[PDB]
């Protein structure tokens, strides 16, 4: 499949490149037009410049349920093995695999061969999860996250067992174009639920920090609903998106990256407008 | 604010650092500006400039040829 996979990658990158070019043309026309309509002033740099909406990789989101594989870094800690066990229950149909002396590239080829849709890798620091990598395997995007405030079900006594049904999804706070891009990657990890499902999973954006919450609700009576929090609780902060798979750091391009040493980096946010 | 008719206008100071010679409630002489046009880096819609303060030209004060009387 070396020859076939190379051909499909080139045409995919070709179509992606054209979409970016036409959008950049729109922004230049839009920013130029609004400036003169204001009639306030003409920036000198503006003077110098003047003188398939659905993502291509996500063909098959609605037709078939996603298949998710979860693994860790080599020689996992005790608590990291518990966290990967909980993430398996969060995602319907997910599977968790032991990472032995497995090369990263060897994992990706096995996942592609068996039709695994998405691959999750989690890192830890002194027994607490600190990083998460989400990769869409058929040459899809790879997103890199850092975890901030992880609270596990194992820490909390006598919770019980979860509903494990297909949950409803809530996306809140994602307004910019990048935020729309990010929320798509998180949403497509989940299958199409049922209308009468009582399981709710929430992604809420606040100053480029994404909060993950898991809940089940019961309607005792009209207009009054009671929420009981279940499942792990953590925060996500994106810092990089790459076009290729996680076997391709050295060749894939960067769609978006966070730049913290910029003179105005402190006061700027990218997931909201 | 013009003394003759009480209107309030916006004028240009020729150079940054001539603002130091001008204080509030001072008396200045104002001439027209911008009939020819507005240069790059000039705010459109301002049609006046400051020429003298206390009957002394701003260039003479800037060049250190005269001192402002109080």
């Amino acid at each position: 499949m070396l020859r076939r996979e190379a051909r499909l990658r080139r045409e995919y990158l070709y179509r992606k490149a054209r979409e970016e070019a036409q959008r950049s043309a729109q922004e230049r026309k839009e920013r130029l037009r609004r400036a003169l309509e204001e009639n306030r002033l003409i920036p000198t740099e503006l003077r110098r410049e003047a003188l398939s909406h659905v993502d291509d990789e996500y063909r098959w989101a609605g037709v078939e349920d996603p298949k998710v594989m979860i693994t860790t870094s080599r020689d996992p800690s005790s608590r990291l093995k518990m966290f990967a066990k909980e993430l398996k229950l969060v995602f319907p149909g997910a599977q968790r695999m032991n990472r032995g002396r497995h090369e990263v590239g060897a994992l990706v080829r096995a996942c592609k061969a068996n039709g695994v849709t998405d691959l999750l890798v989690v890192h830890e620091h002194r027994g607490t999860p600190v990083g998460l990598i989400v990769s869409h395997l058929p040459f899809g995007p790879t997103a890199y996250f850092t975890l901030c405030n992880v609270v596990m079900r194992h820490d909390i006594p006598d919770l019980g067992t979860m509903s494990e049904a297909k949950p409803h999804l809530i996306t809140h706070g994602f307004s910019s174009r990048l935020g729309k891009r990010v929320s798509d990657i998180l949403r497509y990890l989940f299958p199409v639920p049922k209308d009468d499902s009582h399981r709710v999973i929430t992604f809420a954006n606040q100053d480029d920090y994404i909060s993950f919450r898991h809940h089940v609700y019961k309607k005792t009576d009209h207009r009054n609903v009671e929420l009981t929090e279940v499942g792990p609780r953590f925060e996500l902060k994106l810092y990089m998106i790459r076009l290729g798979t996680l076997e391709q750091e050295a060749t894939a391009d960067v769609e978006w990256r966070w730049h913290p040493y910029t003179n105005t980096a402190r006061k700027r946010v990218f997931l909201s407008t | 604010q013009l003394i003759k008719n009480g209107k309030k206008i916006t004028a240009f100071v020729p150079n940054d650092g001539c603002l130091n010679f001008i204080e509030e409630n001072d008396e200045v002489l104002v001439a027209g500006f911008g009939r020819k046009g507005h240069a790059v880096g000039d705010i459109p819609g301002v049609r006046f400039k400051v020429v003298k303060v206390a009957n002394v030209s701003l260039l003479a004060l800037y060049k250190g040829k005269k001192e402002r009387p109080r």
Binding site: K29, L32, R33, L36, I42, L51 | G37, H38, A39, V40
Partner: peptide, 29 residues
Amino acid sequence: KEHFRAKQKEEEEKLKRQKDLRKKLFRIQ
């Protein structure tokens, strides 16, 4: 290099007025 720059300076002068600059930007739009 200096000759090339001086040719652009004449074009920069050829629209150096404020109304001239806004003139093309509507026209390019």
